[PDB]
Every structure is written in structure tokens, then in C-alpha cells.
Design a protein around this ligand. Sequence first.
Ligand SMILES: OC[C@H]1O[C@@H](O[C@H]2[C@@H](OC[C@H]3O[C@@H](O[C@H]4[C@H](O)[C@@H](O)[C@H](O)O[C@@H]4CO)[C@H](O)[C@@H](O)[C@@H]3O[C@@H]3O[C@H](CO[C@H]4OC[C@@H](O)[C@H](O)[C@H]4O)[C@@H](O[C@@H]4O[C@H](CO[C@H]5OC[C@@H](O)[C@H](O)[C@H]5O)[C@@H](O)[C@H](O)[C@H]4O)[C@H](O)[C@H]3O)OC[C@@H](O)[C@@H]2O)[C@H](O)[C@@H](O)[C@H]1O
Ligand SMILES: [Cl-]
Ligand SMILES: [Cl-]
Ligand SMILES: [Cl-]
Ligand SMILES: [Cl-]
Ligand SMILES: [Cl-]
Ligand SMILES: [Cl-]
Ligand SMILES: [Cl-]
Ligand SMILES: [Cl-]
Ligand SMILES: [K+]
Ligand SMILES: [K+]
Length: 446
Amino acid sequence: DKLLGGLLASGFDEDSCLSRYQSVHYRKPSPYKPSSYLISKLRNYEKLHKRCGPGTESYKKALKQLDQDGDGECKYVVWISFSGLGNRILSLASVFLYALLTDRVLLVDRGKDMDDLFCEPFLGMSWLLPLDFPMTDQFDGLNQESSRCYGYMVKNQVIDLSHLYLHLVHDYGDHDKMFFCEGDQTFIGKVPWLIVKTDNYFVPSLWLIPGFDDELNKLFPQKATVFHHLGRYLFHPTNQVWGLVTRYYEAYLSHADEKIGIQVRVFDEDPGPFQHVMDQISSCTQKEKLLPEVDTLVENTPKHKAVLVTSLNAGYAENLKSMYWEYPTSTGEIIGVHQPSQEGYMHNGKALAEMYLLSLTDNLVTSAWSTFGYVAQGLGGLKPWILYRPENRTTPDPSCGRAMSMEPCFHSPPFYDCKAKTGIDTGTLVPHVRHCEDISWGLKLV
Ligand SMILES: OC[C@H]1O[C@@H](O[C@H]2[C@@H](OC[C@H]3O[C@@H](O[C@H]4[C@H](O)[C@@H](O)[C@H](O)O[C@@H]4CO)[C@H](O)[C@@H](O)[C@@H]3O[C@@H]3O[C@H](CO[C@H]4OC[C@@H](O)[C@H](O)[C@H]4O)[C@@H](O[C@@H]4O[C@H](CO[C@H]5OC[C@@H](O)[C@H](O)[C@H]5O)[C@@H](O)[C@H](O)[C@H]4O)[C@H](O)[C@H]3O)OC[C@@H](O)[C@@H]2O)[C@H](O)[C@@H](O)[C@H]1O
Ligand SMILES: [Cl-]
Ligand SMILES: [Cl-]
Ligand SMILES: [Cl-]
Ligand SMILES: [Cl-]
Ligand SMILES: [Cl-]
Ligand SMILES: [Cl-]
Ligand SMILES: [Cl-]
Ligand SMILES: [Cl-]
Ligand SMILES: [K+]
Ligand SMILES: [K+]
């Protein structure tokens, strides 16, 4: 089923984006079926996008509100291309959900590479913000003190509204965080143009806004499927990225009975590679029976496992590779350890290819705090084993634990009760919104 259970629309040109419908020759079918209401919601999104999108007569009329109000036919939310690729992917998926919940059209700031990495997701009509949008060269300078920043208008009690800037970056404050309150969403609902900048996956705090909560439950009744569905919908790699994927997979990974992904990210100043991290990896994989122990004893048909290791430093894959070369397995399993080329013969090209290759594995080990890992697990429908974040170059004990769900984590959530107007722990409100495994103050859907 190339349409992923109805998540994807038919009718796209096959050759101009091979990944779109070929992803099925490489992936097991997801066990999570998109709800019929999410399927309607996306097919209706496409209708709206086609009516209101870039370059249409409607879009051109709405652009004049920026020089005025207005009272128009089409409203928008523009995603600003900000931060690293994994932050971008998650944040964009979040802004897309927000569009869905508010009957807005999503426009994407293409930044330096978005059109080079991704195909168009909306049948008929591009998702890219036009390059001559007049506010574009203000995007980097938009901040908490910008006149039309929502938080600035809140704290100053500004009275007038064609557009608003929503500062949702990790450094945001109390006023900016009022985005996550119902009364503020009523106000913001009236503004035809929203401009968002964020480096977080802010999905889970949408679930705690009245009104959004009812709609979200209809769309995603199993709760922890938001990124799995919206990520698969939105993001299809371009043919040159997908070539990197298919060629790697077919050469190195395709013969194995089971594929293990290991996504290594080490948040440290010094270059590496670190023994305590090597030790963490071997212990994790071996205590969870993802990879077999080796032994030095002198003294029944063999599975073949392929281990895909992604990392900035090649030492982690080398260490594992060498271990399984130099010693027999205690189980008799055949282990091959593989890592993609570090040196080129599209920096982001290879990075995206690697996230996709991880998503094609059977069991995935991720690194704590890594949005790169979140993207991979989400696209693959993998509930990972998470390598906990080390402190002071000491192997954590336990080394890893299974995640609660495949969802990504919101790293910098608000902690505010909008009704009582005071701080609250927003990870103890509803059972499906919990604190993350890897980052104790973050939130995730479970
Ligand atoms: O949403 C966060 C968002 O951040 C993006 O990255 C941006 C962010 O970087 C922060 C992290 O920097 C790392 O260092 C980088 C460095 O930026 C680069 O220059 C360098 O080349 O690479 C380095 C990595 O190799 C540090 O390793 C991190 O520590 C830092 O994360 C922040 O960590 C502190 C806590 O630090 C302690 O944790 C253990 C240990 O690792 C560290 O040394 C300790 O000191 C957090 O502060 C705590 O925050 C909590 C929660 O409060 C927040 O969230 C809830 C909201 O309501 C609050 O308003 C909000 O403040 C608070 O309760 C505690 O009191 C605080 O101590 C920070 O929250 C962590 O962010 O900023 C710089 C920018 O350059 C980066 O791009 C990242 O890419 C995104 O995925 C996402 O994580
Ligand atoms: Cl419509
Ligand atoms: Cl990244
Ligand atoms: Cl395309
Ligand atoms: Cl400023
Ligand atoms: Cl409110
Ligand atoms: Cl669902
Ligand atoms: Cl790293
Ligand atoms: Cl899994
Ligand atoms: K493209
Ligand atoms: K998979």
C-alpha cells in the first residue's frame, strides 16, 4: 500500500519524487493506522492549500493585508527556517499541526536547503513561501522585542492587526508562552498572518489547550501517533537524497535477517571518541538482547544482523566493528557493523539520508536529547531504546531504557495553568502527556 493506509493522496508524479511511493519497498507496513478523521482532515487541508496557496489569486489578495484590515478568505501561518535539521523537521511538523487546528494555510520558509531535501507534500500546489514575500528579510531579526511579537504586545498591553510574530524559540518567556493558553488562541485566531519561529517540538502542549484537545483526540485517538503520521505525510526526500538511502540499504543492509540502528550523538566540547560512550553502547545493546555478547572461550542456524551506526565521529562504529571481528558471538549470530561514508567523494543531504536509513531499521537505539534520533524513530514507527545522557564521562547505569512511545520530546514546555494564572507541572495533568525519559522536564505524548 503505497498510500500508507490513506495518509497519502494519489496522483503525484512518480518520477519527480521516487521516495514518495517507493518508501513501501523498503519499510515494513506501519501498525498504526491513520484515523479516518485525520485522513479527512488532510484531504480537506489539500483543498484549502490549493485555494489559498502561493501564487493563487487568493494569496495575492491576502498579501495586501500586510499593507492596510482586511476580513479575508484565507489565513496563514509561516514557518521560519531556524536551527538544525532535526529541530526543523520537528518544528515544522508542529507548525503544520497548528495550521490544521486553526484552519490556516502553512507556508514554508525554504531557507538554504528545504527544497533541496524535500519533495512537495501537497498535491497540486507548493508549500514554499515565495521568495519575494515582503517580510522575508526581517525573519532573522524577529525577536521578543519586535513590535508585532505576541509576547511584546502582551507585556506592553498594546491596543489596535494584520500579522503577529510568535517567538517560540527555547529562550522564550512568560509572555511568549501565553501562546499556549485558550484566551490567547482566541485573539490570535483573528489575525490573518502568523509568523512562527521555533526550534522545539511543541505538539504536546497543544493537547492541554481547551478546544484543541477535543479536535486532537478525534484526529489521533491513540495519542502518540502525531509525528508518525504528520512526519510521514509531510517529509519525502528528494531523488538525490533517496538515492543515498536506497543505494546504502541495498548494498549493506538488505541481506540481514534483522537490522539494528544505533544513533550516536555526544553533546561534548572535546571531539571524541569517548570510552564511556563505547561502553554504554555495548552494555545497552547487550543487556537488551539487541546484539549478542562476545566471548573468549575455546570450547542452531545463524541469524545475520546488520548494525547501522550513525555518528559524527567514526570511532563508535569502528569500536563495535572491531569487537565483532575479533571475537566470536556467544550466540553464533553473524554481526556486520556498518557506517556511512564520513568523507565525501548536501551536508544536509547525507544527514537526511542517515535519518532515513535509521528509520529503515528493525530496532533503534537513540541518544538522549537528540532531535535527530526523534526524527528517525518517528518516520520509522520505532519505539527506541534511549542511551541516557552521561554526566562527567561516566557510563550511565542503567546504560539505556526503552522509550515510553515513539513520539518526540518537547524540550522547553510552558509550566503555566492558564485558568488559575500560576505555575503548574504540566506533565502531571492528563495521563497521555508525560515527562520525557531523557530530559526530565520535557513533555511527550504517551
Ligand atoms: O529547547 C531547547 C532546544 O535547544 C537547542 O539548542 C540551543 C540551546 O543549547 C542548549 C544546550 O547547549 C549545549 O551546548 C552546545 C552549545 O550550544 C554549542 O555552542 C556547542 O558547540 O555544542 C554544545 C553541545 O555539544 C549544552 O550541552 C546543554 O547543556 C544546553 O542545554 C540546556 O541545558 C540546560 C541545563 O543544563 C544542565 O543539564 C545537564 C548538563 O548537560 C548541563 O551542563 C547542565 O548545566 C537547560 O537549562 C535548564 O532548563 C530547565 C527547563 O527550563 C526550560 O524548559 C522549560 C521552560 O519552561 C523554560 O523556560 C526553559 O528555560 C530549567 O528547569 C533549569 O533551571 C535549567 O538549568 C536548558 O533548558 C537546555 O536547553 O541554546 C543555545 C543554542 O545555541 C542552541 O542551538 C536544541 O538544538 C533543541 O533541540 C532544543 O533542545
Ligand atoms: Cl477550502
Ligand atoms: Cl540535526
Ligand atoms: Cl516534488
Ligand atoms: Cl533586540
Ligand atoms: Cl486562557
Ligand atoms: Cl491515532
Ligand atoms: Cl556527536
Ligand atoms: Cl519498535
Ligand atoms: K524539491
Ligand atoms: K522501521
